[PDB]
């Protein structure tokens, strides 16, 4: 697959797309760091809420890797129904409120913020490129017009010189 990636390393058109989308690396890294911080905050919160009491709910808010994976699933839409049915039997009524608050924070913030950020970044990156292309076409048009005007002036001067000398 790395060899196939070296194959697709060609196609200067794809290269231009890569250049046009390459200025958002810092932005997506910043959003990824924010999302990682949110995972860390709710990871320690879910551990302190369900795994320290050690009365069940193991490998969902217990061990660190399984807890992180369950938090990622809860930040997405998948698995939330079965996770809720698993957690509501652990004698924790406010766990449902905490989980729906976590959903309405994490899922909405991550998805909508990412789509908005990328939408503005690509719109403003395409806008300047299209403006520059139209500007270069404009300079080409004015250069052609100036060349035509110079040729017409030279022809008029040559005609006047021939009329004067004849």
């Amino acid at each position: 697959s790395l060899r196939i990636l070296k194959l697709i390393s060609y196609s200067r058109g794809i290269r231009t797309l890569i250049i046009a989308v390459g200025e958002t690396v810092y932005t997506v890294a910043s959003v990824l760091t924010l999302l990682f911080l949110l995972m860390f905050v709710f990871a320690i919160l879910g551990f302190c809420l369900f795994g320290v009491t050690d009365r069940g709910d193991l490998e969902n808010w217990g061990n660190l890797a399984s807890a992180f994976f369950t938090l990622f699933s809860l930040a997405t839409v998948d698995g939330w129904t079965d996770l809720q049915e698993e957690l509501d039997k652990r004698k924790f009524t406010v766990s449902r409120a905490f989980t729906i608050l976590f959903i309405l924070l994490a899922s909405f913030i991550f998805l909508n913020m990412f789509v908005g950020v990328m939408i503005m970044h690509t719109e403003d990156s395409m806008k300047k490129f299209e403006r520059d292309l139209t500007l270069e076409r404009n300079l080409a048009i004015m250069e052609e017009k100036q060349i035509i005007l110079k040729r017409q002036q030279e022809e008029v001067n040559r005609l006047m010189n021939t009329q004067k000398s004849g």
Binding site: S1, I8, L17, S73, T76, W80
Partner: protein, 281 residues
């Protein structure tokens, strides 16, 4: 006659009303007949047969429609715009009559594909509104702008799928009796299907828990690989496609605004030259 008759029957509003009435009657009748073909109502059995034969009569109306089409430019119409696709669909809708007259359809009839083809042709030739055609023009120019993004999407799908074929190999190729997602990661086509499922992101939690039945080798490479693939691919591709879509809308509206601005400038110049002419007189 011929082309003049075709122009007259296209211009007449009674013929257009009749053909659109027959079209939506046929679409409404079509899915009724598949509901019941038994002796639940012996009184409505002959009239249901008569309704199916009325559908055959709509097919005959399609043959006289292609006769009116022969009254047009004839050989020039064999290579044209979407009208030739409509002609091909009407031919494919005439085909089931032949394959039930001589084909003995106790086999793979494929009558349903031709039926849905004529249904979509009827649903498209329904005198589509202005508010349909403007967004359809936007969609087709959007798919014209879909030049390199789609090959980027399919090639990233290709590389990630062929990478993930031999990563959870010990999932399907294990001797665990109790498992139900083993079919997902077995074949290359199965790998394509399951990474497409991961791309749509449905029950990724349940998929991960079902792959967790593999002996956990400290999750150092495989689980992080599939999680990063699903997250990055889904968010990046959905995001770049929506960003290009809003960019298409932006440049469509920019072109419309600059056309209106040029029209207003031309109107200002026209009124200024009208004042110039009035003073010159």
């Amino acid at each position: 006659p011929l082309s003049l008759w075709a122009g007259w029957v296209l211009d007449s509003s009674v013929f257009s009303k009749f053909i659109i009435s027959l079209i939506f009657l046929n679409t409404f009748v079509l899915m009724v007949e598949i509901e019941l073909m038994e002796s639940t109502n012996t009184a409505l059995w002959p009239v249901k047969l008569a309704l199916e034969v009325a559908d055959w009569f709509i097919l005959l109306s399609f043959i006289v429609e292609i006769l009116l089409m022969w009254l047009a430019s004839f050989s020039l119409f064999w290579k044209d715009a979407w009208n030739v696709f409509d002609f091909f669909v009407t031919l494919l809708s005439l085909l089931p009559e032949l394959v039930v007259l001589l084909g003995v359809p106790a086999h793979s009839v494929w009558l349903q594909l031709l039926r849905v083809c004529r249904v979509l042709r009827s649903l498209k030739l329904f005198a589509r509104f202005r508010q349909i055609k403007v967004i359809l023009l936007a969609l087709v120019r959007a798919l014209k702008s879909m030049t390199f993004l789609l090959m980027l999407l399919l090639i990233f799908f290709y590389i990630f799928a062929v990478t993930g074929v031999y990563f959870f190999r010990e999932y399907s190729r294990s001797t665990i009796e109790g498992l139900e997602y083993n079919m997902f990661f077995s074949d290359l086509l199965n790998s394509l299907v399951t990474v497409f499922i991961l791309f749509t992101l449905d029950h990724w939690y349940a998929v991960l828990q079902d792959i967790w039945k593999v002996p956990e080798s400290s999750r150092v490479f495989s689980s992080i690989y599939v999680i990063l693939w699903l997250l990055l691919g889904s968010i990046i591709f959905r995001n770049i496609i929506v960003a290009m879509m809003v960019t298409n809308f932006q440049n469509i509206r920019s072109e419309l605004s600059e056309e209106m601005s040029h029209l207003e400038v031309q109107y200002k110049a026209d009124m200024f030259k009208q004042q110039i002419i009035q003073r010159r007189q």
